Amino acid sequence: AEYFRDEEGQDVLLFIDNIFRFTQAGSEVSALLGRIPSAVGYQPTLATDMGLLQERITTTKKGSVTSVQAVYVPADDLTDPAPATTFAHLDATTVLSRGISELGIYPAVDPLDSKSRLLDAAVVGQEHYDVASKVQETLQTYKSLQDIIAILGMDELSEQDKLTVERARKIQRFLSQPFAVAEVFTGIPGKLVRLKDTVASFKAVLEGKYDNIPEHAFYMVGGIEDVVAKAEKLAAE
Amino acid sequence: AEYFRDEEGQDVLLFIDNIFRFTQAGSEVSALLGRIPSAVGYQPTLATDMGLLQERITTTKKGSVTSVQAVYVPADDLTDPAPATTFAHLDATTVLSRGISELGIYPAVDPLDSKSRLLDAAVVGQEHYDVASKVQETLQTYKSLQDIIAILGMDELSEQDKLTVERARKIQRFLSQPFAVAEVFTGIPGKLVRLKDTVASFKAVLEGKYDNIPEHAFYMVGGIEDVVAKAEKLAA
Amino acid sequence: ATLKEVEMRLKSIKNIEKITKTMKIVASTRLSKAEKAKISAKKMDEAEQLFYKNAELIVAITSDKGLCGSIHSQLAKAVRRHLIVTIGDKIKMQLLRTHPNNIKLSINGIGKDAPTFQESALIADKLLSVMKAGTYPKISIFYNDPVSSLSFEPSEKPIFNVPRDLFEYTLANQMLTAMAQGYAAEISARRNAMDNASKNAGDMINRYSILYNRTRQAVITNELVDIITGAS
Amino acid sequence: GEWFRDNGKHALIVYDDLSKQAVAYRQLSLLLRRPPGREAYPGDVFYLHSRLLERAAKLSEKEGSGSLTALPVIETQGGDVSAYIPTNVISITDGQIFLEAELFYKGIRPAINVGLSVSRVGSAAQVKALKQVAGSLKLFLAQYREVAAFAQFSTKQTLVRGERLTQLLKQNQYSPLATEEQVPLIYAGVNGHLDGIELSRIGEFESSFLSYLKSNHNELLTEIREKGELSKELLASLKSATESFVATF
Amino acid sequence: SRAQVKAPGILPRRSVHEPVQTGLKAVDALVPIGRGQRELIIGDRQTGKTAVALDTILNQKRWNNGSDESKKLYCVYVAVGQKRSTVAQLVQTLEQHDAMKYSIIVAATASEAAPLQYLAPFTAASIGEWFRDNGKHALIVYDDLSKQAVAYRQLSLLLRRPPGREAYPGDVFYLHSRLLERAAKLSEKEGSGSLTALPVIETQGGDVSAYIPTNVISITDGQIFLEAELFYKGIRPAINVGLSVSRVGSAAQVKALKQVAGSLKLFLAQYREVAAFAQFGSDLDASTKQTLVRGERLTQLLKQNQYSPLATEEQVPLIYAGVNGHLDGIELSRIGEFESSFLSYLKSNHNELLTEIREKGELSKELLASLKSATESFVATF
Amino acid sequence: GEWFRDNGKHALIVYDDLSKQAVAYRQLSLLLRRPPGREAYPGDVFYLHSRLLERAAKLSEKEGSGSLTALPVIETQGGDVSAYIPTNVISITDGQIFLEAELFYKGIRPAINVGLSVSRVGSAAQVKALKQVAGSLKLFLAQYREVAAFAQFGSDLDASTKQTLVRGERLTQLLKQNQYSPLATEEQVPLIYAGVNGHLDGIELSRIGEFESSFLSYLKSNHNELLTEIREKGELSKELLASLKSATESFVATF
Amino acid sequence: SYAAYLNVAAQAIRSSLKTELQTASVLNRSQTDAFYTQYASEPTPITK
Ligand SMILES: Nc1ncnc2c1ncn2[C@@H]1O[C@H](COP(=O)(O)OP(=O)(O)OP(=O)(O)O)[C@@H](O)[C@H]1O
Ligand SMILES: [Mg+2]
């Protein structure tokens, strides 16, 4: 990739799957090299041996590199030293979590732990940023209410919170998407949803334009016109 | 301090701020010296180092080295070995809680987190203990009712529960005191109350003998023989 | 994540379970009086309605307090489905978000205990002296019918010098009956709701107990691992 | 197994169970004074399993077309799949079948948790006739789980369909049924034609219906056997008997 | 100047009494920072720590452009274990806002050998110590000390030194202490200077019980605790006002802001006492409902945009409105509007009040009365 | 203690407290550089406390019939009993007295958790009078620790459990007794008979102490015979039990 | 006011009951303990 960047001058994109296996490799050998192990069991050089790899993956005035790195989380513990160190090196980080996938919401991207530096009104525009902020607020309200829901039932919630919760459930589910490569194990044909369509659809949902539509129609459709279509289909069948 | 005790011949009080850092530096030196670290990372010599410090702080024929030791509780976890080992040597606890400063009750000592071993009738006397127990019972009742008073108005309380609550607030504020060193801070004359003159006062409060008077008059006074004076000024 | 956090979480959930369990018993204790206040008023109603069997506004009755589960929600659903005067803060709240301009009269404070003819009569008296319900074709009462110790149904009963005094009276008597049946339904719904809540609390406690055990094992393993690295 | 794989024959290797292999390598490593890591396992407990399970492969005809399939078993403490060794083998393997104790004790046997169970090869390995019929049943039951969880706190249609689908999948030990016998039922299952059948009757259905096709319809099973995939004509001939029997049932 | 140079002692110091105006409402008003203080910006990954430090750095150009070297707060930003592209984005941010001319950026990035990550904070402290010692004021941001601790751990373990807690060496506290304690305020015998430290710590899972967090929380004079659950609710900066505390406290607050911040703090403390029933606000008691309303509106009132520090003249009217209860009539969502409109009005009208809250720094009763007037007028228009 | 044990005398050894013995052995082992175990304690700590404790024994008439009773104290951190040393000592001992801080702060002293406390042996040792009279006390106290969470509520309180809430309150006031004032069995059993048989119901909860102090006098003076026979003969024969009922009803009619 | 008239007569007949004869039900049957507010928002709160 470095030669394609610097000596050939072209635009490069570098997929690394999976970078954790680098650090783990350094761990496997660290004990045999005679080092005293660090925390949970990683090699002391974890912070530097990673950087010398990670710092080379970057954009430069010679050429551009767009990197997508898979970072395995052992035991789902994002506190494990390796993911914790990797998080510092990435402009955009989408944390796939097991809980969302148990809910059948593929692609299982935790709508809250996931973050990107370019989510700023300066870059994405004010409309997109307000939509994203309303989405995050709604989902965090749902996750905060989850205990009241689990114990006292949803009926204890006020109208504002019942609506916020139904809307959060619609939204967490509307974030689902069928991938054309996942069809061989999900059946549902793949969908590509453009950015503007996503912003406008989530805006329409936040504004309550589709409170009437049931949750199940938001699942695995793609855009909101397909939310409407699946709703019509559930109603017909 | 021990020289003032042994050779000077008079009682002295020793301030150690903070003992958590005695234990911390002990763990640092032990890890450096290569002693196998114990539980969470403290030295094996934790208890014996603490003892060799503390047990020189004691009374004897010529006098006493009192100690008032600030104890930092990391992560607010009293079960950390450092505070847990410090607790085995101290017998009086004074908790300065910000939540008591929010109510403006200076010097902000938590009337319930603070505890002392000498509160036994054998040491302070049965009267002092009965009075302090009534104070603690009332304040614990108020703290318990604090949730219900928010979920439901105070009109929902029984008159006896409402009475315990009102006398709890009055007890709270009579516990406030103007310090003499703090007279420059805000001007307050800063009175100091004898122990007997404190028991006899919180007694008069508890019995309802002095329930006639308002909350703010109990604020920052050096005795009920001064709270009545303040209340006479206010009523006038 | 750490042991102290799971411990405080579990302690809070245990306190919640304790509170809801106490509330269930309290509700069961009040149910004994609610049942009798319902029985007597049911007999009185059947007696008065014998006359309507031979011969021939919307007052929405609920409580002021929540945690009744779906009581207020189902009664508001019934009101909107059929569709005003509200008795209780909660139905008033359900309606105030949807038809603020329709609430003419709101009554509060009666939800705390069984209804008495004094309460019903004075509420009717405000309907007659303030709302002037006189000669309105549109009069009916929406209220909860307690079907079983585990169910309640939103219901409606219509409303209709003695030929006028009898309406002026059955207003109070049917309002009493509706408040009594609503009190029984509310108490039963709260018993059921707090029982369900305590069961859910026990389930959450089981889950967080699994987590406490797992975090205990992990804590010990990590600490002894560090110690062993030190002892090399 | 690699001898069958390499010489053009097909094999299947059941590891029962790798949690205990990991415990054994943990012993071997710690006794060698290898520094412990997560869950006191050695840092290379991953390599132990990767160099085992990666050998399960399907080859091209250059190397003889053979294959080796691996069905590793892992024991989960307290039903937590977040543990170190479980996560490592989930990361190595192409999928997981998660068997839940809550379902097993309820009598749902085999206790397949449809939500957490997933096979990333999927339909490509599935017999054509089952891909042609099942649609997206896995995601339907994954969603049914959450729908029921929140119902506890027209959804009734999804919930009914999911309960009946879950009940339909039960099977008795040592009693396997070939695909000719699975294709019929999953149509009545997925297309919700079972909604008109009470839950407790499903166990009566699965056999009676199987007896109906085998008793009368040799023409359908002797097709799905020899063909392996449904022509829309045979699919019609199956939707027909399903509607007929279900209306009878 | 040497990297490891002894911190100043008791005698030469003078007590922290003057403010590091961050422009962040949630800080100046509830956990103030004075010139000479040491304030831990502690929070989970991506919870807003660098944003607080950088809003602080950016605000100073109100004072650093002028004439008096006493108001000017020159800044040093130590980037430890960060990637060089992040430092490039940081210098681009500082250049957009012109803040580089008074900021020094010291970079020991992740690729830099571990010794340089361990040493960089000390050399940045020696840089700021020049401003301190020569009668100027400085602000040093360590971003972040967890990675310095990791670098020192690598150094120590590869030196075959014995590990302690979390595999960190037995003298990491001595490291961070002899680093931070160099932040001080000096007395007129030594030049009246100062150096203020804003160390960042990366708490995993919010565990303040980890070793390096436990140490730094005890070394520093206070902490700004950033929480993700607050961040996702739109409370940004995500400062957990409850967990956040400042030991210098009122001595650092601007007088005008101390006046109102006392009441702000009292009301938010009541709100925190009640918060357990925030989702049941309807049926609660009248007083509890009042406190829930006002606490929610105050918590909202503190949120402000990235790279946008408000001057104290704009904070004071706003906290006044929140405390005295004028905002109780405003829908929770419109508060973001209220600020942006309300401040404009205070420039369209009553400009003297802002001008004097800046000049005098003190809300004399006349200014408080005129402020009440303006607040009533605009909440009438609103 | 083993000397009194072997030579035909009964002994009592109070370890205050073994958590600090465990800490001391942990230091001693870590400085000897012996390999540590859980919580940095050495591996054999179970052996430490077992080797210490179960030396306590009751010998045969063939070995001297002496005895040694061990009352080891353990300071639990935050009430946690799952800690290593507590987990071991709970398993080594025949029973436990769990002193609860939640009770100590409420002024219930001695703050014994009647629920978690257990004696898997002593039921066969209890002075017969107290077994007789306290047969119902454990049940009553458990019922009270169930119902007490409901103490605060108003007149809607069920009549059925109101008796539980009365008897349990009175029994809790009875079971508390001032420090350095241990009572003789002859003074113990009459109070527990009054409590279990519900004689104290007609007494205000703040005056139970005045009962316990006054009742002991009414027994000592008016019914010396009853106390004397209870201590000297050791059990409450039915005649003495009727004497006890009569004396309690008499004082309570007086009180 | 027919039901109202019966309510007044009932309070009379209830207070007429001997103080040694009143069960708590009687003292309760006099405790309305309710409020009403006209109604958009409430113009006036009062007892009921
Ligand atoms: N004032 C603000 N309001 C809203 N969002 C903000 C604000 N400041 C920063 N952010 C967002 O939060 C993120 C900033 O992360 P920040 O740099 O503050 O944390 P950090 O110290 O880098 O943590 P880490 O080093 O672990 O990433 C960016 O995605 C940015 O868009
Ligand atoms: Mg940062």
Q: At A213, which amino acid appears?
A: I
Which three-class secondary structure string do you get for chain D? CHHHHHCCCEEEECCCCHHHHHHHHHHHHHHCCCCECHHHCECCHHHHHHHHHCCCCECCCCCCCCEEEECCCCCCHHHCCCCHHHHHHHHHCCEECCECHHHHHCCCCCCECCCCCEECCHHHCCCHHHHHHHCCHHHHHHHHHHHHHHHHCCHHHHHHHHHHHHHHCCCCCCCCCCHHHHHHHHHHHHCCHHHHCCHHHHHHHHHHHHHHHHHCCHHHHHHHHHCCCCCHHHHHHHHHHHHHHHHHC
DSSP one-letter code for F68:
E
Half-sphere CA count of D132, side-chain side, radius 13 A: 19
Task: Point out the residue among B98, B150, B152 whose CB comes nearest to the CB of E274.
Answer: B150
Length of chain G: 48
- Count Cα atoms within 13 angstroms, Cβ side, for D172: 5
CB atoms within 10 A of CB F120: 9
- Domain membership of residue C205 as a residue range: 1-25+194-232
Locate A101 and state its tokens.
């996938």
The Cα–Cα gap between A229 and A211 comes to 15
What is the spatial distance between Cα E311 and Cα E15, in angstroms, rounded to a whole number? Answer: 24
Pick the catalytic residue: D55, D120, D161, D164? D120
CATH of domain G1-48: 1.10.1620.20
Q: How far apart are CA E155 and CA E168, in angstroms?
A: 10
CA distances from D95 to A23, D2, D71 (A): 24, 21, 10
Nearest to E259 by CA among E35, E29, E27: E29
> In angstroms, what is the C-alpha Rg of chain B?
22
Query: Helix or strand or coil: residue E138?
Result: strand
Give, for C187, the enclosing helix (H) or strand (E).
Answer: helix C162-231
CA distances from F26 to A222, E169, F22, F48, F85 (A): 63, 22, 6, 11, 11
If one counts every other C-beta atom within 10 angstroms of the C-beta of residue D188, the result is 26
What's the length of chain A?
A: 237
DSSP secondary structure letter of residue E203:
-
User: Per the omega criterion (within 30 degrees of 0), is the bond before F197 cis?
Assistant: no
- D219 is written with which tokens? 């023409």
Contact list in C for residue B37 (CB cut-off 8 A) is: 226-227, 230
Distance CA C199, CA C191 (A): 12
Cα D185 from Cα D224, distance rounded (Å): 13
Tell which residue, E221, E201, E229, has the closest CA to residue E36: E221
Q: For chain C, what is the domain count?
A: 2
Residues from chain C that touch B75, judged by Cβ atoms under 8 A, are 4
Rounded CA separation D102/D210 (Å):
29
Tell me the one-letter amino acid at B51.
G
Contact by Cβ (8 Å): E195, E149: no
In three-state secondary structure terms, G38 is strand
Instruction: Evaluate whether E56 touches E28 at the Cβ level (below 8 Å).
Output: no
Tokens for E155, please give them.
């150094």
Q: Does B189 touch chain E (CB under 8 A)?
A: no
d(C-alpha E332, C-alpha E299), whole Å? 10
In the numeric block, which tokens belong to residue E38? 């040491």
CA distances from E43 to A49, C95, D73, E237, F51 (A): 25, 44, 40, 11, 49
Number of continuous H segments (helices) and E segments (strands) in chain A: 11, 4
- Are C105 and C37 within 8 A, CB to CB? no
Among protein residues, the one with the nearest Cα to ligand 1's atom 27 is E46
- Both tokens of residue A62? 């010679």
Using a 6 Å cutoff on CB, does residue E237 contact ligand 1? Answer: yes
Domain boundary among E195, E223, E253: E253
CB E90 within 8 A of CB E104: no
Is D225 among the catalytic positions? Answer: no
- Gap between the Cα atoms of A74 and D38, Å rounded: 9
What method did the depositors use to determine the structure?
Answer: cryo-EM
The SS3 assignment for E42 reads strand
Q: Please, are residues C77 and C102 in contact by the beta-carbon 8 Å criterion?
A: no
Answer yes or no: are the C-beta atoms of E121 and E185 closer than 8 Å: no
Kind plus residue range of the DSSP H or E element containing C143: strand C140-148
Residues F235 and F127: their CA atoms lie apart, in Å, by 7
Q: Which helix (H) or strand (E) holds C87?
A: strand C85-87
Which of C73, C97, C197 lies closest to A151 in CB terms? C197
Is residue B23 within 8 Å of residue B50, measured between CB atoms? yes
Q: For D76-89, b where at least 16 C-beta lie within 10 A, e where not — what string?
A: beeeebebbbbbbb
Rounded to the nearest 10 degrees, what angle do helices A195-206 and A126-152 cross at? 50
State the Cα–Cα distance between residues F199 and B17, nearest whole angstrom. Answer: 56
Integer Cα distance of E26 and E237 in angstroms: 8
- Min CA distance, B27 vs chain E (Å)? 8
CA–CA distance, C49 with C44 (Å, rounded to integer): 9
Position A173, amino acid: R
The whole-angstrom separation of Cα E77 and Cα E74 is: 10
| CA C216 to chain centroid | 42
CA–CA distance, C42 with C44 (Å, rounded to integer): 5
Whether C6 and C48 map to the same domain: the answer is no
| Dihedral angle of Cα G25, G29, G35, G38, to the nearest 10 degrees | 140
**Rg of the Cα trace of chain E?**
21
- The strand ranges marked E within A53-189 are 65-69, 92-93, 115-116
Is the alpha carbon torsion for F185, F187, F191, F197 positive or negative? positive
Q: What is the CATH number of domain A119-236?
A: 1.10.1140.10
Instruction: Give just the sign of the alpha carbon dihedral E322, E326, E330, E334.
Output: negative
| Cα separation of the two ends of chain E | 58
Per DSSP, E309 falls in state P
Domain ends where: E199, E231, E253?
E253
Q: How many CB atoms lie within 10 A of CB G32?
A: 18
Report helix angle E335-348 to E365-381, nearest 10.
Answer: 120
A14 beta partners:
A67
Taking the C-alpha atoms of residue E24 and residue E303, their distance in angstroms, rounded to an integer, is: 9
Q: What tokens does F212 get?
A: 């316990």
Long-range contacts of B202-208 (CB under 8 A, 24+ apart): B202/B131, B202/B132, B202/B135, B202/B171, B202/B174, B203/B127, B203/B131, B205/B167, B205/B170, B205/B171, B205/B174, B206/B131, B206/B134, B206/B135, B206/B138, B206/B167, B206/B171, B208/B163, B208/B167
* Ligand whose nearest atom lies closest to the CA of A83: 1
Q: Compute the Cα dihedral for A133, A136, A142, A144 and give only its sign.
A: negative
E150 token code pair: 């990791």
Residues from chain C that touch D79, judged by Cβ atoms under 8 A, are 210
Number of neighbouring beta carbons within 10 Å of residue A208: 10
Residue B37 and residue B31 in contact, taking contact as beta carbons nearer than 8 Å? yes
Give backbone dihedrals phi and psi of B131, rounded to 5 degrees, phi first. Answer: -65, -45
Mutation pick for ligand 1 pocket among E25, E49, E59 (CB with most ligand atoms within 8 Å): E49
Q: Which is nearest to D203 in space by CA: D185, D220, D219, D180? A: D185
Locate the ligand 1 atom nearest the alpha carbon of residue E304 and give its number.
1
Sheet (strand E200-202) strand order: E200-202, E39-43, E222-226, E245-246
Which residue is closest in CA terms to ligand 1's atom 7? E306
Domain that holds residue D216: 127-248
Between CA D63 and CA D70, with CA D67 as vertex, the angle to 5 degrees is 145
Catalogue the E-assigned strands of F15-93: 67-70
Residue linked to tokens 């109780």: E328
DSSP bridge pairs for B109: B96
DSSP assignment letter at F232: H
Q: Which two tokens stand for residue A161?
A: 């919170």
The CA distance from B117 to B90, in Å, is 9
Partner C contacted by G47 (CB < 8 A): no
Q: How far is the CA of E306 from the centre of ligand 1 (A)?
A: 9
| Alpha-carbon gap, residue D29 to D149, rounded angstroms | 43
Name the nearest CA neighbour of A106 among A168, A179, A195, A191.
A179
CA–centroid distance for E135 within its chain: 23
The token pair that represents E179 in the structure block: 């680093």
Residues E85 and E221 placed together within one structural domain of the fold: yes
Strand arrangement, sheet containing C59-61: C151-158, C140-148, C59-61, C85-87, C105-108, G35-38, G45-47
- Report angle CA C101, C106, C108 to the nearest 5 degrees: 150
Q: Are residues E40 and E170 in the same domain?
A: yes
Residue nearest to ligand 1 atom 23, measured at CA: E46
Question: How many angstroms is it from E130 CA to the middle of ligand 2?
Answer: 26
Three-class SS state of A14: strand
Count CB neighbours of D37 within 10 A: 27
Residue E44's nearest CA partner among B164, C55, D130, A115 is: A115
Let me know whether C8 and C47 are in one domain.
no
> E147 with E80: CB under 8 angstroms?
yes
CATH number for the domain harbouring residue F193: 1.20.150.20
DSSP string, chain B: -HHIIIII-S-EEEEETTHHHHHHHHHHHHHHTTPPP-STT--TTHHHHHHHHHTTSSB-SS-BEEEEE----GGG-TTSHHHHHHTTT--EE--B-HHHHHTT-TT-B-TTT-EEGGGSHHHH-HHHHHHHHHHHHHHHHHHHHHHHHHHS-GGGS-HHHHHHHHHHHHHHHHH----STTHHHH--------SHHHHHHHHHHHTTTTTTS-TGGGTT-S-HHHHHHHHHHHH-
Cα of A117 from ligand 1 centre, angstroms: 8
**Cβ distance A48 to A54 under 8 Å?**
no
Rounded CA separation F135/F129 (Å): 10
Q: Give distance in angstroms: CA of A70 to centre of ligand 2.
A: 21
Cβ atoms of A113 and E231 within 8 Å: the answer is no
Q: End-to-end alpha-carbon separation of chain C, Å? A: 29
Q: Would you call C134 an interface residue with chain G, using a CB distance cutoff of 8 Å?
A: no
Query: Within 13 A of E338's CA, how many CA atoms are on the CB side?
Result: 30
Same domain, E144 and E3: yes
Sequence-distant (≥ 6) Cβ neighbours of residue A18 within 8 angstroms: A69, A70, A71, A72
Q: Cis (ω within 30 of 0) for the bond into D110?
A: yes
Residue entry with tokens 């148990």: A102
